[PDB]
A paper describes a structure:
[name] (LigIV), one of three DNA ligases in higher eukaryotes, plays a central role in the repair of DNA double-strand breaks (DSBs) during nonhomologous end joining (NHEJ). Human DNA ligases have a conserved catalytic region consisting of a DNA-binding domain (DBD), a nucleotidyltransferase domain (NTD), and an OB-fold domain (OBD) (Tomkinson et al., 2006). A covalent AMP-lysine intermediate is formed with the catalytic lysine (K273) in motif I of LigIV (step 1) before the AMP is transferred to the 5′ phosphate of the DNA nick (step 2). Artemis is activated by the autophosphorylation of DNA-PKcs (Goodarzi et al., 2006). It has recently been found that Artemis (residues 485–495) also interacts with LigIV (Malu et al., 2012).
Here, we report the crystal structure at 2.4 Å resolution of the catalytic region of LigIV (residues 1–609) in complex with an Artemis peptide. The crystallographic structure of Artemis485–495 in complex with mercury-labeled LigIV1–609, in which nine mercury atoms are coordinated by cysteines and methionines, was determined at 2.4 Å resolution using the multiwavelength anomalous dispersion (MAD) method. The structures proved to be very similar except for the conformation of the loop between β11 and β12, which is distorted by the binding of thiomersal in the mercury derivative (data not shown). In the derivative crystals of the LigIV1–609/Artemis485–495 complex, the poor density for adenosine is consistent with partial adenylation as observed by DNA ligation assay. Although density for the αPO4 is evident, it is likely that AMP has low occupancy. The density of β and γ phosphates is absent in the derivative crystals, probably because ATP diffuses from the binding site while the crystals are soaking in thiomersal solution, as observed by others (Håkansson et al., 1997; Pascal et al., 2006). Artemis485–495 interacts with α1 and α2 of LigIV to form a three-helix bundle, burying 436 Å2 of the surfaces of LigIV1–609 and Artemis485–495. α1 has a kink produced by the proline P15, which is conserved in higher eukaryotic organisms. W489 of Artemis (italic font for the residues of Artemis), which is an important conserved residue for LigIV interaction (Malu et al., 2012), makes a hydrogen bond from its Nε to the side chain of D18 of LigIV. It also makes van der Waals contacts with the conserved V14 in a hydrophobic pocket of LigIV, the conformation of which is constrained by I145 in α7 of LigIV. The interaction of the side chain of W489 of Artemis in the hydrophobic pocket appears to be stabilized by further interactions of F492 of Artemis with F49 of LigIV and F493 of Artemis with F42 of LigIV, consistent with the earlier report that W489, F492, and F493 mutations to alanines disrupt the interaction between Artemis and LigIV (Malu et al., 2012).
Author numbering:
A (entry chain A): 6 to 57, 60 to 114, 124 to 605
B (entry chain B): 486 to 495
The structure:
């Protein structure tokens, strides 16, 4: 009658098992202790439920793998809060060595506390595992509601009714790090042969505990399911030199790499759920239905007529309508707020589909999966998009793509095997990611001057797509630099507001560049700008680049490989520009 | 009704 094993098992038995596992040296011994507990629980369950069942090992497992808790929200509990509380309850001298050590704990804490507890708290535990869960539930729920005093009272119950040793373990469950000395994967494997695979397509300990309650009954065709959080497929880092072999000497896809929030979308008619990469529920943000949220109302009607159910994998971007650009994560500005203040909007960049109307697609080829994707919805630029991809088979094509990508201020490229299927939580297989070899030194901080510009297209024709940048020729002692040598073209995409602000600040200073009557202050190579700007009116940008290579396109006789503007350095005057001599020393060092 | 202590300390 809604009976549970957890209501019968002292939290003390769970803790004595954790203590034995942690103190065991060998893996074998660690596993044995876990097995003995798990096995007793299973036999008890069978006896308890003979004449009845959704009950399972979940109440224990959620405490054994606290980092996998998904039902309960954050506790909001700091080591420093526990410290004060213990100092009260144990009546420690407020200025003594024990009190200070607790208060001055440097980020383990459970062990420091336990040593203070062992000789002064002799109480025997009284809580069942179920009652421990109830109090943790209370802590989390009260934290959500910022009811500080109720959090304390729940903590107070946990502490006054638990043994010193149990308190050691409570602290670790609260912090979410047990330090058992045995891995999460081992825990899963010991529990059920299928537990890990199931967990990968349902990020839910309860589901795994309940569905795999019987260790001798497997699950067939474990797969991605509507409204269950699967772990995203991951990309392995790839050295661009080996890319043709890595793609099984056959044709492959090159796809744009977006740095947003990895997000999967689940749809059934008017009902929507969204899961982040860790399997937390973001439906409150994006929208459970077409009349609420920051995204769903705007994309519900993009879906094609025949599509009732679908599951998508992709990336959430912050899109600027006025510039038609995605804003990068790293900015001095507030992306979340501007999204809320309607300055920016949420855009779902989609690169995969795992289900359409009850066809499951995990095992289809990425090739087939992409085909299907174009049938799911009609893209709306700036709300819901299909990530751009192309076919390629050559290393040089990949060099081209990376070159283009960095130019547009993207930070890398993706490469994908068309034959490949979708493997949740696996890194490698069909998905590779490629980024520039950035070596962190002076090469990360090239401080150079903007000397010229190139216009964007159509309506973005008022904004610049690229800047031309130069270094200073070292001037006679006393005077400011008067001659600059071009060094590199670099992308000007408004992926951060400071670049937008910079463009508007410089707008009034551009002058038409004439090949036949060029300004004396700017010396060029092959590459000429559309417009230039007098040095004293300009701004220094800090540039990250992977390599300095020879070039006849720039006056310096060389240029920057994969250059990206990192910062606008308006804390510098134009004449503080890096010189030819600096460039020269940098190159050969 | 089975008692847990028989199952655990076994
Ligand atoms: Hg105590
Ligand atoms: Hg489980
Ligand atoms: Hg997008
Ligand atoms: Hg912008
Ligand atoms: Hg722009
Ligand atoms: Hg710009
Ligand atoms: Hg020139
Ligand atoms: Hg000036
Ligand atoms: Hg150079």
């Amino acid at each position: 009658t809604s009976q549970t094993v957890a209501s019968h098992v002292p939290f003390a038995d769970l803790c004595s098992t954790l203590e034995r596992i942690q103190k065991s040296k060998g893996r074998a011994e660690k596993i044995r202790h876990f097995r003995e507990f798990l096995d007793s629980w299973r036999k008890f369950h069978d006896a308890l439920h003979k004449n009845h069942v959704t009950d399972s090992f979940y109440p224990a497992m959620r405490l054994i793998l606290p980092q996998l808790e998904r039902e309960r929200m954050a506790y909001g509990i700091k080591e420093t809060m526990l410290a004060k509380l213990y100092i009260e309850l144990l009546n420690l001298p407020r200025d003594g060595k024990d009190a200070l050590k607790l208060l001055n704990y440097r980020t383990d804490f459970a062990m420091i506390a336990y040593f203070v507890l062992k000789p002064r708290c002799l109480q025997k535990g009284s809580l069942t595992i179920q009652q421990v869960n109830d109090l943790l539930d209370s802590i989390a729920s009260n934290n959500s509601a910022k009811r500080k005093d109720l959090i304390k009272k729940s903590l107070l119950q946990l502490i006054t009714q638990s043994s010193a040793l149990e308190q050691k373990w409570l602290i670790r469950m609260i912090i979410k790090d047990l330090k058992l000395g045995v891995s999460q994967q081992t825990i899963f494997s010991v529990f059920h042969n299928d537990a890990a695979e199931l967990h990968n397509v349902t990020t839910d300990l309860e589901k795994v505990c309940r569905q795999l309650h019987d260790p001798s009954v497997g699950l067939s065709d474990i797969s991605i399911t509507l409204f269950s959080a699967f772990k995203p497929m991951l990309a392995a880092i790839a050295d661009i030199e080996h890319i043709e072999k890595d793609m099984k000497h056959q044709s492959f896809y090159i796809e744009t790499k977006l740095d947003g929030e990895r997000m999967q979308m689940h749809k059934d008619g008017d009902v929507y759920k969204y899961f982040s990469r860790n399997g937390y529920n973001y439906t409150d943000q994006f929208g459970a239905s077409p009349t609420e949220g920051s995204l769903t109302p705007f994309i519900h009607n993009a879906f094609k007529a025949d599509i009732q159910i679908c599951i998508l994998d992709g990336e959430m971007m912050a899109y600027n309508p006025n510039t038609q650009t995605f804003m990068q994560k790293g900015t001095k500005f507030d992306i979340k707020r501007m999204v809320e203040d309607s300055d920016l909007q949420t855009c779902y960049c989609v690169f995969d589909v795992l289900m359409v109307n009850n066809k499951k697609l995990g095992h289809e080829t990425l090739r087939k999966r992409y085909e299907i994707l174009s049938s799911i919805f009609t893209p709306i630029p700036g709300r819901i998009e299909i990530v751009q991809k192309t076919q390629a088979h050559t290393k040089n094509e990949v060099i081209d793509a990376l070159n283009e990508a960095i130019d547009k201020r993207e930070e890398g490229i993706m490469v994908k095997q068309p034959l490949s299927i979708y493997k949740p939580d696996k890194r490698g297989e069909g998905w590779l990611k490629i980024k520039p070899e950035y070596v962190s030194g002076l090469m990360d901080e090239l401080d150079i001057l903007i000397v010229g510009g190139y216009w964007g297209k159509g309506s973005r024709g008022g904004m610049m797509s690229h800047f031309l940048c130069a270094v200073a020729e070292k001037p006679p002692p006393g005077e400011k630099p008067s001659v600059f040598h071009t060094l590199s073209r670099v992308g000007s995409g408004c992926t951060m507001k400071e670049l937008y602000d910079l463009g508007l600040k410089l707008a009034k200073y551009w002058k038409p560049f004439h090949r036949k009557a060029p300004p004396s202050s700017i010396l060029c190579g092959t590459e000429k700008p559309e417009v230039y700007i007098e040095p004293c009116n300009s701004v220094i940008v800090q540039i990250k680049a992977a390599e300095i290579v020879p070039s006849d396109m720039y006056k310096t006789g060389c240029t920057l490989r994969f250059p990206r503007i990192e910062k606008i350095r308006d804390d510098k005057e134009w004449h503080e520009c890096m010189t030819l001599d600096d460039l020269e020393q940098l190159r050969g060092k | 009704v089975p008692q847990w202590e028989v199952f655990f300390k076994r």
